[PDB]
Design an enzyme around this catalytic site. Structure first.
Site, PDB file in Angstrom:
ATOM      1  N   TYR A  76       0.846  -1.180   0.000  1.00 29.84           N
ATOM      2  CA  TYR A  76       0.000   0.000   0.000  1.00 29.84           C
ATOM      3  C   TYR A  76       0.884   1.234   0.000  1.00 29.84           C
ATOM      4  O   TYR A  76       1.889   1.292   0.716  1.00 29.84           O
ATOM      5  CB  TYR A  76      -0.877  -0.015   1.262  1.00 29.84           C
ATOM      6  N   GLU A  85      -3.398   6.780  -4.699  1.00 27.20           N
ATOM      7  CA  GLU A  85      -3.332   5.808  -3.617  1.00 27.20           C
ATOM      8  C   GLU A  85      -3.428   4.421  -4.250  1.00 27.20           C
ATOM      9  O   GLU A  85      -4.353   4.159  -5.020  1.00 27.20           O
ATOM     10  CB  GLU A  85      -4.497   6.047  -2.652  1.00 27.20           C
ATOM     11  N   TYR A  87      -2.789  -0.033  -4.241  1.00 25.49           N
ATOM     12  CA  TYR A  87      -2.840  -1.303  -3.519  1.00 25.49           C
ATOM     13  C   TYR A  87      -2.452  -2.511  -4.376  1.00 25.49           C
ATOM     14  O   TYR A  87      -2.977  -2.663  -5.480  1.00 25.49           O
ATOM     15  CB  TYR A  87      -4.312  -1.611  -3.043  1.00 25.49           C
ATOM     16  N   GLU A 176      -5.344  -3.018   6.699  1.00 23.12           N
ATOM     17  CA  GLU A 176      -6.398  -2.020   6.721  1.00 23.12           C
ATOM     18  C   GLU A 176      -7.661  -2.688   7.244  1.00 23.12           C
ATOM     19  O   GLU A 176      -7.928  -3.853   6.934  1.00 23.12           O
ATOM     20  CB  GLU A 176      -6.636  -1.446   5.315  1.00 23.12           C
TER      21      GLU A 176
END
Length: 189
Positions: A76, A85, A87, A176
């Site tokens: 991440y 952002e 992942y 997360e």
């Protein structure tokens, strides 16, 4: 638990963030190790890695990951300019984060096929303040909690598909959670 924030621990960059809800504890251990225990949490992200990341890092991770509800285990991080952002999702709980997302391709890396997606966050928090920005996803088909991630295979496939990364900011192996419970113990290198 440690206080939410960022810093260095045993040579590794770490980031621990939560929404203030309660129900999550994050601890830094020896070397690249970190643990997360959560019970009826809010939203949080915690893990170890690098600041800044690179576009050709081979990230090794090992341990246990036991979510009960909505949670992810991923490589991440963020880029700047453009603000992204991203992942590389190795495992998850009750929710596949790509549900309903536009599929942008596939890439084979490190023993599995991954499906690639792009989503958009609108007027949401980010490393530079409230912003609208894209998220890039590689979601592993064969779920696991140890392995090696050749980040270049993902970043190159994303670029091939028109998903551009800017200058790297932090890059971690992160647990997360979103309003869930679980436990995890992960060692990064």
């Amino acid at each position: 638990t440690i206080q939410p924030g960022t810093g260095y621990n045993n040579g590794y960059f770490y980031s621990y963030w939560n929404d203030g809800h309660g129900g999550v504890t994050y601890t830094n251990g020896p070397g690249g190790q970190f643990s997360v225990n959560w019970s009826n949490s809010g939203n949080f992200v915690g893990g170890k890695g690098w600041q800044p990341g690179t576009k050709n890092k081979v990230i090794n991770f090992s341990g246990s990951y036991n979510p009960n509800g909505n949670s992810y285990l991923s490589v991440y991080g963020w880029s700047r300019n453009p603000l992204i952002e991203y992942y590389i999702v190795e495992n998850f709980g009750t929710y596949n984060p790509s549900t309903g997302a536009t599929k942008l391709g596939e890439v084979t890396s490190d023993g599995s096929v991954y499906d690639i997606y792009r989503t958009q966050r609108v007027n949401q928090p980010s490393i530079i303040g409230t912003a609208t920005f894209y998220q890039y996803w590689s979601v592993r088909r064969n779920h696991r909690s140890s392995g090696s991630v050749n980040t270049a295979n993902h970043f190159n496939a994303w670029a091939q598909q028109g998903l551009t990364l800017g200058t790297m900011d932090y890059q971690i192996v992160a647990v997360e959670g979103y309003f869930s419970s679980g436990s995890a113990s992960i060692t990064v290198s």
